[PDB]
Design a protein around this ligand. Structure first.
Ligand SMILES: NC(=O)c1ccc[n+]([C@@H]2O[C@H](COP(=O)([O-])OP(=O)(O)OC[C@H]3O[C@@H](n4cnc5c(N)ncnc54)[C@H](O)[C@@H]3O)[C@@H](O)[C@H]2O)c1
Ligand code: NA
Ligand code: NA
Ligand code: NA
Ligand code: NA
Lengths: 493, 498, 495, 496
């Protein structure tokens, strides 16, 4: 932290906020202030957007060869790997998740940049067989333009990489703003990108409250695409604001992801994966398997096994090797999780285990919340329908394959889910009917740069990762040339 | 005139496999803009009718009867629609001309295009179910399956009713979606007729639905209902924005096409007479009521005076009249409200200091007195700061601005909130290509105007829209990607203590 | 009655013409060995004239520069004619080739779908725009029709195989010269009549009738040919490829196979028996996709052999026009003799002819080219009867112990066209499918193929593909057009 | 020279550097002075067979063929980085072995780095397609797998460049390969094998055979365990290879040179056209598959063009590829120079004019090398052997044409179809012409431009298939349709 920048990065320069305001960043493990950064203004955000537009129109990045753009994106990928240790530590300090989880993030981030580096020069568009004689028809794919990018606090650098990599690869200019409470890795990646070298204005980092600078990032006339990952309420607000300029939006908003366990699942595998689904990063994951659906014939056996394991989950400091689950991100977020416990009980569900702050001494100063299992609930309940985004799972039974599908689809969301069954034919039937962007068969949480990620229904609009993710950052232009032009002579001479 | 067509035309909405009146029995009189006479009367539906249609589309979608039909068979049905369009080409063209005022010849060209749109998408239906991914994780299979997006609402404008409908209906049916369509309340005739033809082909109950009525009565239901997966709208910018904001309530995908301020760039080395011809075509086809209209002429200074004179002299000869008469070159505008809007723009142009060089009023001639006619108009001595240059008038009106250099042409052409289409005229093809590469437009024509077709995507940069219609990209609006990842050798992670 | 109005001539450069030497050939019905029709037997000069006419038409641009959309519409019109004449075409095919009328109806439905598929694909490409690594350049790849193509088909599924070649050729804008098997030209003549009704520029389509040994070499070895597409046997295929090499001409070959039908002990047993029968005996095993090599898990091998043999004895032989017929005759005297000589080979190597292996004695079968459905047991991979394509109503049965051994045995042939895996354990069937060196692998099915997916062989089963986008791509050629938009002198060489 | 002290002299088979089975060797020559510079193993047909069988064994093991596509990409990228790291030494080796200028060799090495990088990036970007099946209750997918065992044979003009075009996609897709460079120019290929060994590939995945095409070539093209033969060279050897591959119905990818037209209209930028006619004709002494050996010039400017070209041809600086002022080095071998010389006799006997050059240069410092003067042949026509046949030397012919139509007819009037250019300031016209030339690559107002992002290959007798681009990678893939019936039912056709 001694050498980490504390400033925004606008138009090739590290700069303070226009009003000199600052914000203290906290470690959720002990609620101690660990760093202080600039808290930018809406005029700073506007200046970044105007700089991105100017850089885009200069052509220095947008007209660079795709091959060269790919080489630069690859150079970022290499810096991530080179600084893997320090990045992982920063991420754990800022977000609370285990160091091992943070190492896995850094390995993935390297692969994300590498994937897009390699995709950069592989399209360009299509030649069309024109239906009009004596014409040439082609579709050229250009960078979409100036893009704003807003990320959440759970996986700051990972989510940032999903946006930055395709934007740079395609030739866009970008303005990024990480969550105000978790900016450290994002500042660091900007330092690394500056070392690679990009024309002035091509990349910009704004630091600040979503409520202060967010609307300018979603509502400015010079933006061609707003790409946001976070919660549903902010997402909807952002889309409404983007509508003022008919601006493209790419949204990923979390989910109510079903984890469907059939009676012919590998039982110990399913228990393992129900734990993974529920409690990695204290359930603060877009992909969290918060809604367990278990076949009735094994429901009691399953609940007992799960509960017994949940009691053994090891809570602690993300830097300690024995820690299995760290704290949740903030006081506000822990309070929200606590109020959901009251909701669940008032609706008549059972808090089978957990449901409170742990009492242990070394956990007292941190934002800890016990891994929790909620039983005796049904699809009509708020605790089942709503994304708690904490270390909490619900358990519902189902009788038949048809019922599992109906229940799993009975939410406003559609991001991801899993089916556990040794009968692969059955798992595939079920997968084909789930209205989800990603379905895992005998697995959980698996995602990678090669394949698109995103939501049906209220889980989002568009995709990130894969060729489809890159396509958000492109725009099609049909250039039609009449090679033997003739007068139409419709209007009198 | 047009008579016999209407004798057997349905007057009702089509919901869940039945032709039905409005829930409140309300009706609306449809007008011919040539003479402002009532030509037909149709049901004016309610918001509950729209909701019932949406719920019927959802039920049909979940039944799987269309959404799980083979893509090959779906293509065959979309092809059968295409064949019915061609079979009824004459009656459809006549209806369209009766309802919208444009010339019969223009309507025939629409019907040919509509046939080709359905045929294109019929052929595309079974050509792409997704991808196999080379997974980075050993012992996994990764595949991307493309499914129909789901239930789609489709809202069309009054200028090219059936054409715009076909751009939405064809890919929706080809992919296996269920749909609810609502044409403009003032021009529903061809859309009713195409629903009759689709019914003849045969689609499961609830797969297709037609709502008739005011956007202000049923529009919000169509854009804001939780059971909709995609709202596809073609029309004006204000309504588009409102629709997008409403769709946000359910994070619903939107596909918008909203018109433009399309530049027609004429260099001093253009084929002069060609450029004059195409400036006229750009400006005045369908009385300029076209998303692709070339309303903003940018002409190189060295030939600007010559160009203005030639264009003005031609504009005075444009033949106004009944769309059914063979000599007619330009029909009336669509409604009293729209003519009034065009008129108020003339006042704006003069107040900001532009010159109405020719036209700018209603014609006096006797056979035109009863119709919604407005003279083809040329506005000169204007600049990019003016409202008359920046805003879409959507009437038989063009502005003319000069430019000195290639760079200036590009800067001016890009200086608008829009980005739908434009043209470059020059015999120096290398130059036209440079310019085309720099225009922020979804479509650029080199030595042509108004050319569009099913094979290529159409849509706007900036405020001209979101997404694309036509082409493979158009079909993709009606698809959704699902990543199915199978772990073929699953192992416990053993992260959490046992 | 069909035959009363059917043309007897070749179709060259827009005209129905006799052979240059007036020679003819009698066409036979294999059910009764009776002459049913007589057609021209063309010369090598006729073939050359067709090729030169195809070249001329191609260079005129009338088809090759027609819009892709309009080409598609014409291919679609052919598809509709096939359906319209479905009954007569099916009857002709059954008369000429001997297979059951029901099989022929299924062919005609498929043929309609092939033409329709390619009609729909015609205008869906054109090529790519490339993001060039050189500043101030535009790089595009335009896909053009390959050019003049020669097309040679076999006698088992004449029209079906013809459609696989004609449809993409016309869709892409090529000119073509087609020659069906000399012994089965009826439906191919008919389809040329139908194409003439649709209307194509003169020289775009040509039909040569005659012996492969008389006109074949011209079709494969002429300098004006850009692609030779052949479906048939391995020996002719190799000969063709060697001849095509004289002009470095592209080749697309599909040469049959030794297709494994792998049955695990956890297969749905009755399904596997049913499909082993389908695999072995449809069209008297005269199918590129025939499942002639059964590999059955040792644990169920005796059970399987007994059940298969008992069913094989009930197979109903007869006239393809009779509804109760399950298997018709084989195609010719020469082919039946070849099948017979294989029986001698199998016995000399020590295999057992468990059932069949001879001509049936029954009276109504005496005059036709019948051969009994046959099962050969007690054999192994070293045997000629196992390694070689018999292309008759004959299957061999070998046992395997493990999954690994099934794969090893199945892949132990020179061929690589198609095969199946039968197992209720889908995971296992998929593992096996990934390791088989075959262009098509069926999991719990057999003989399934369709226009939407490419068909072709690894190893000695062929080169290239037919059907699907890949099938169309055989009839395209890529051209990279690179424009320097700001050309500068290099000034390497002294001024 | 110091380069050579540590360079391997052996073949690389099944993970080991090995000598020829019979200890035979071959002396490698520098064409600048005809001196022996190195001695390598001259392998036997049994060595080639052993390599092929090792490639097959490796392929079946799955260690490379089932490695993740992402990881295969990373390895191909590591090869790319080694090429750039060793750019200087590789360029010098290439110049020493082939005679071309050091500057040309540097450009090759830059291009080779980009080829490996391109294919590294493409490795994990496909996998196949999901098909919407026309049969209910079925799942249809096309999986793209490595084609299998591939044999790769390269020529002497751009040894490492041509090698990279084959190696990169083969490794990216998961194939096993056996490569054999031209017997007279093996140095950079040996070196690249050393570099690949440093990256690390499973045993048998890569193999290098060294030797005479006439001794080991037939095994490489005719062995039953080969799935693809990829050959770049001359037409006669290509045809022989294709005939041999036919014995096992083996896929072939051939690129065989051309008779590439350089079409110059009277509205071309004249000085640009002269510059590019020189580049087209004389880079690497015309020993280029892309050489613009057939100039077609509009009649109206033909005399002006000839005079301007001839005057420049006289100024071309011949010399040692290592000297900075050298513009054109020697041709590759005695046999090749003799072939070029016999073509001069042919041209004269047919009545063409040798307008300039047409002989060995007399100058002292050129006396010991395999030099041949840059040559312009005029007063010829399309019926002549000198016009129809690929000389592959520093020689161009010049023919006139009257109209656009005639330019096209003449340019297409050859057995070949690899590449060509159109020079005209009228871009509309250049595009019309380009659309009608039967060529795999057409340059508008440029020459010799090719790159990994776009496919390269020939119409007609210039080849079969493509190298470079996605289409190049596709030569190293094979499609398998896996069709699963998810609700199987008995057909019940045959009696029970
Ligand atoms: N892109 C085009 O082709 C196009 C078409 C028509 C109009 N325009 C432009 O838009 C301007 C306004 O045209 P307009 O107002 O006559 O048409 P509009 O933009 O309102 O679009 C008409 C369609 O939208 C429906 N609609 C109206 N309110 C709605 C709501 N709240 N929710 C859902 N649907 C609703 C209408 O009933 C009709 O079907 C014109 O002056 C012109 O500049 C462009
Ligand atoms: Na959504
Ligand atoms: Na937009
Ligand atoms: Na083969
Ligand atoms: Na060829």
């Amino acid at each position: 932290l001694k050498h980490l920048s504390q400033r925004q990065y606008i138009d090739g320069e590290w700069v303070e906020s226009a009003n000199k305001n600052t914000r203290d960043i906290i470690n959720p493990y002990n609620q101690e202030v660990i760093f202080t950064v600039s808290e930018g203004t809406k005029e700073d955000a506007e200046r970044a957007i105007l700089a991105a537009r100017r850089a885009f129109e200069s052509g220095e990045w947008s007209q660079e060869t795709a091959e060269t753009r790919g080489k630069k994106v690859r150079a970022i990928a290499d810096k991530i790997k080179e600084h893997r240790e320090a990045l992982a530590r920063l991420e754990t300090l800022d977000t609370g998740k285990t160091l091992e989880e943070s190492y896995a993030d850094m390995d993935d981030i390297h692969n994300v940049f590498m994937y897009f580096a390699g995709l950069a020069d592989k399209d360009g568009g299509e030649m069309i067989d024109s239906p009009i004689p004596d014409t040439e028809s082609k579709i050229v794919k250009e960078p979409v333009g100036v893009v704003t990018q807003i990320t959440p606090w759970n996986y700051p650098l990972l989510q940032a990489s999903w946006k930055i990599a395709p934007a740079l690869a395609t030739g866009c200019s970008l303005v990024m703003k990480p969550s105000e409470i978790t900016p450290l890795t994002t500042i660091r990646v900007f330092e690394l990108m500056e070392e690679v070298g990009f024309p002035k204005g091509t990349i910009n980092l704004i630091l600040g409250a979503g409520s202060e600078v967010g609307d300018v990032m979603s509502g400015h006339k010079e933006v061609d695409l707003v790409s946001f990952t976070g919660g549903i309420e902010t997402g909807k607000h952002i889309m409404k604001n983007a509508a003022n300029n008919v601006t493209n939006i790419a949204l990923e908003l979390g989910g109510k992801n079903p984890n469907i366990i059939f009676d012919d699942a590998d039982f110990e595998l399913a228990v393992d994966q129900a734990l993974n689904g529920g409690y990695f990063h204290a359930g603060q994951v877009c992909s969290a398997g918060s809604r367990i659906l278990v076949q009735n014939s094994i429901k009691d056996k399953f609940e007992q096994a799960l509960i017994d394991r949940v009691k053994k989950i090891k809570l602690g400091n993300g830097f300690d090797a024995d820690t299995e689950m760290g704290p949740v991100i903030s006081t506000e977020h822990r309070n929200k999780i606590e109020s959901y416990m009251d909701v669940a009980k008032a609706e008549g569900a059972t808090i089978a285990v957990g449901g409170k702050r742990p009492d242990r001494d070394d956990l007292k100063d941190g934002l800890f919340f016990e891994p929790t299992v909620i039983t005796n609930c049904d699809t009509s309940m708020r605790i089942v329908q709503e994304e708690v985004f904490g270390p909490v799972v619900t358990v519902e039974g189902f009788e038949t394959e048809q019922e599992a599908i109906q229940l799993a689809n009975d939410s406003i969301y559609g991001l991801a889910g899993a089916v556990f069954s040794k009968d692969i034919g059955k798992a595939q039937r079920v997968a084909n009917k789930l209205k989800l962007g990603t379905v895992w068969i005998n697995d959980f949480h698996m995602l990678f740069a090669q394949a698109p990620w995103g939501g049906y229904k209220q889980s989002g609009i568009g995709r990130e990762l894969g060729k489809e993710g890159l396509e958000e950052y492109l725009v099609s232009k049909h250039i039609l040339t009449n090679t033997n032009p003739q007068l139409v002579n419709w209007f009198s001479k």
